[PDB]
Amino acid sequence: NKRVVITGMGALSPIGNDVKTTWENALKGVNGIDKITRIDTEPYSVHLAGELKNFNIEDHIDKKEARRMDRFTQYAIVAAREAVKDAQLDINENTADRIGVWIGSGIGGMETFEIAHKQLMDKGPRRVSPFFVPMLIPDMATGQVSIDLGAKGPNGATVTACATGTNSIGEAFKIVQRGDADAMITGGTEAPITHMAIAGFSASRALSTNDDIETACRPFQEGRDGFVMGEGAGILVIESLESAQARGANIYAEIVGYGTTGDAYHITAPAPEGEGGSRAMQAAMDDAGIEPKDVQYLNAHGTSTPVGDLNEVKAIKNTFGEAAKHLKVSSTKSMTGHLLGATGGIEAIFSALSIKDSKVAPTIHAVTPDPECDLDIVPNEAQDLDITYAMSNSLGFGGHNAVLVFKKFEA
Amino acid sequence: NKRVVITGMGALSPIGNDVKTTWENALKGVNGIDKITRIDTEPYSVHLAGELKNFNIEDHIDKKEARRMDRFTQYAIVAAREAVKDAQLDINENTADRIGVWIGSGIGGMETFEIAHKQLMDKGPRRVSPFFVPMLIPDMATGQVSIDLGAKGPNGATVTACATGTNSIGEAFKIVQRGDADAMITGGTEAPITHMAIAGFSASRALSTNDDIETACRPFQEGRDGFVMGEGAGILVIESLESAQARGANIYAEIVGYGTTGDAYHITAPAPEGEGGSRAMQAAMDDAGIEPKDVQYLNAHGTSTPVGDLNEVKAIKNTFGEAAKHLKVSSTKSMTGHLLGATGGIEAIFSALSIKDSKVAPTIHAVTPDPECDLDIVPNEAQDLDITYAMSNSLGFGGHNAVLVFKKFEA
Incomplete structure (x- = not known):
């Protein structure tokens, strides 16, 4: 039973557009929650969310090859790249077959559905984009990431709501442990700040109605009235000990x-x-x-x-x-x-x-x-x-x- | 490595509302493909699909509880029950903790999304049902199935498009093999016959526009022009050998x-x-x-x-x-x-x-x-x-x- 180590990390969060921004800001107790800028929150009761700040996808991927990605896939691609760079994992003809991807998304392409459904309704089915299905479905983060990186090992996604990121990493962990991959690019990604998700989660009373940012989200506290929605991606590169040591990689844990x-x-x-x-x-x-x-x-x-x-x-x-x-x-x-x-x-x-x-x-x-x-x-x-x-x-x-x-x- | 056996089977398919019907009908080369009755197919180029025949959910689940389930979950519930009955697996105070669920759905609640999004648009965010989210997401089939059966072991869903059913079973297989559960109720489920799914898949040119019920789906043959969409659920009860033998269960394979x-x-x-x-x-x-x-x-x-x-x-x-x-x-x-x-x-x-x-x-x-x-x-x-x-x-x-x-x- 092989030992599994973390050699790389990649992150896009409300408190940083990379791992060490995110981490440093986390130790300074920075607040990622703020007024929603992505959608018009006029008809809702929730107006606060943890959005990515100062993030342009075109800094990372060409426009043509981004318009064909829902935000949840965009975040996964950017975070996976960061993690592979960080681990300095070389994915090539000799290694690719044993380097997999296991990235889950709890919700998937919410925004994509909203756009394409508006189209079908308001303008007929014939003007629905041929890129709708591969933009919408939850496993498309994993698929697109593997294509982007050339990773060909075990390829999947564990979708389990809020536990999606943890399960996906856990599955990837056991895949390396059983010896079915030398390395896995794994984790969670989500872009839920959309009309339908805010309207859905507040309908079920899970969201906070608090408009003030300094107390909106207050874990374990008096007055806590539900969670505050946030976006981003957390990606890990995990390897067998053999593999990490053989290629000379720094180990996080x-x-x-x-x-x-x-x-x-x-x-x-x-x-x-x-x-x-x-x-x-x-x-x-x-x-x-x-x-x-x-x-x-x-x-x-x-x-x-x-x-x-x-x-x-x-x-x-x-x-x-x-x-x-x-x-x-x-x-x-x-x-x-x-x-x-x-x-x-x-x-x-x-x-x-x-x-x-x-x-x-x-x-x-x-x-x-x-x-x-x-x-x-x-x-x-x-x-x-x-x-x-x-x-x-x-x-x-x-x-x-x-x-x-x-x-x-x-x- | 622990030996993993199949003790129970449950199925809802275009050629039968249970395993015996489905399998018998399968050995007779029965055609499940026919004209769509689920939705008005007038504006589309695809008019065929594999729908369940003579299936009423009220025969299995009370209307009050079924109304809170998208078809894909409804199918998972009914098929899982059949597999459990078939295996005669008893889920109780002593066993439940080691009996898990791992059922995937590649697409999840397509219909639920269409309904709720329509209401959000032409009515408003406050008319969105509080049951929208738990009806919509893909892991809800696993969630609802475990609640319905009392199964409390490893809980998940592997979402990998067309490969969802197979991956899900593979994960459940590996969970039992590593000894993390005694039994797993696992498989795939799908209710893809919806406006947005037909429009989505034909837009990407993946569906046949063929109307000839007897040639629409011709695998491996000359005139093949894409897949024909179907609905259903395929659920297995898988168990360790020691467990199946201890409780005295018939083994399929x-x-x-x-x-x-x-x-x-x-x-x-x-x-x-x-x-x-x-x-x-x-x-x-x-x-x-x-x-x-x-x-x-x-x-x-x-x-x-x-x-x-x-x-x-x-x-x-x-x-x-x-x-x-x-x-x-x-x-x-x-x-x-x-x-x-x-x-x-x-x-x-x-x-x-x-x-x-x-x-x-x-x-x-x-x-x-x-x-x-x-x-x-x-x-x-x-x-x-x-x-x-x-x-x-x-x-x-x-x-x-x-x-x-x-x-x-x-x-």
Whole structure:
């Protein structure tokens, strides 16, 4: 059973258009949420989202070969390129067949559908673009990324809502571990800031109606009224240890555990006591061959929803027990917003970078605490911390629970 | 490596509302393709499709709960129930945690999107149903299926276009094999017969505009002009050998191999000479520990497209070699149509049932033999054949290739 290491990272987030902007800004507690500029939010009750700032796709890809990509694919391509450059992974005739792509998108090409549906309705089916289908479907990020990079190994996408990025990485992890690829370009991507997504998520009352930016998203806090939608992509290049060392690559961290469970409870509501989340955390630690004692850091799912944030704390308290007081939890979503599919990818990056730099990003807006949520939230300011094992949680709609455990590399 | 066996099957297809009907009808070369009744097809050039016949959802699910499910989820629920009943898998307090769900849908809730987007446009954002999001996204079939059955093990969905059914099963296979679950309810589902899907696929020139119900879908033959769209769901209950034997379950077949590759060539067009397809077939055989000599049957992808069908034969020829003209290949899409997400599941079923009943389903409409596609396609009439190893290919849009290898249960 081969050892799997992280050799590259790529990111586009509301707080940075590359990994170290994103990461540095994350340690300074920067706010990615702001008034929506992408759409006219007049008829809605939500006007805030974590949009990418100062981002031009034409800086990265030619116009003709971009007009044929939905934003969610655009972000994946840019982030994957960054991660491959970072790992200095050479994808060529000798290596391509064993270098795969496994990038999920929870929502897919929402904007593309809206445009093409308007067309069919308002102007007839005959004027629907021949590029509609390959722009719309969730696996098109993976397909387009593999074409762009020449990667030919195992090729897929795990679509599991908010847990999409974490599951996709986990699958890619087990693909390398079983020896079916030497390297995988993996993670999550999402472009949900659209008419239909805002109207859909607020219809189901999952979105915050707060118009003020300084408290809109406030994980684990009094007054939290749902998550704030964000966009971006979190991509990892993961390799076998053999491969990484053979080509001489720098190692960020090792991936050692992956657990996934289902609540089998409600289609949108978390299972009471966060029971599914607990079983997922336990499975990931059983995979890693560790116990709760060994985990210093946990990047929480913490979306700033009443039940979610409460149920996660309950899950953590049940699973860790005594070690719950002596455990650093952070919800980086407080800065980025909930990136949906892409959130698990970006959080895997945050987690692995936390092990490397011995730091933990804060949970900003930690103003009005909660007697129910009595965990070490690493409030408002970044703390130093020596980490050996980090956890990342993703507990999304549909009852999907996904957890990854990362480990410091030393030999 | 733990041995993984198929204990249950469930199916909804254009040629039957359960496995027995579907399979029996399949061995008689029944035509599932007929004029579309789902929607007014007047402004389009395509008027045929493989719709479910005499299927009412209220026979299976109460109207109040069905109204909150897109057809693709409705199909997944009904087929999963059948496979569970078939396997007599009991999901309870002691088992649920180790029984997972992994059901993919390549397209998800196309109809739900069309309805909600229309309301958003000509009425307003506040008239959008609160059930829109959980009806729309692709992982909701897995979410709703696990809730309905109480299954709580690994929870996910592999979305890879036409290869969705096959990849999903491959993932579930690997989950049991690594011992992360005792059983998995897995497969593909799809409800693609919608305005936006017909307009989308014809715009990209992938659908036949043929009206002749008896020649619309002619896999591998002379006049083929694209695929014919179908709906349905193909669900398997797969289990560890130890588990199936402990609870006393009848075994259909064993899953022994799984390969997945990426073309890294074109978004819709197959890699030249089906090179990616060949690597996927080789990977699955390497996984299974067999050579091309050992395969008696291969359920081909064969969607009735010029380039696709030709490139698959090329892939088969390149990979099997001498054994190529001693291989029994067949494309069951000739009868069901191309079910997209569901097709991988429906074909895994056919492949496994082919090993059990030692009978191969035919490729109907094999009227005009194309000189380039010179394979043993089991023309028009079902043949008898002893099978030890069966292959199922799925090579779809986005450059995704997925191959499973099944094996007659030994001991």
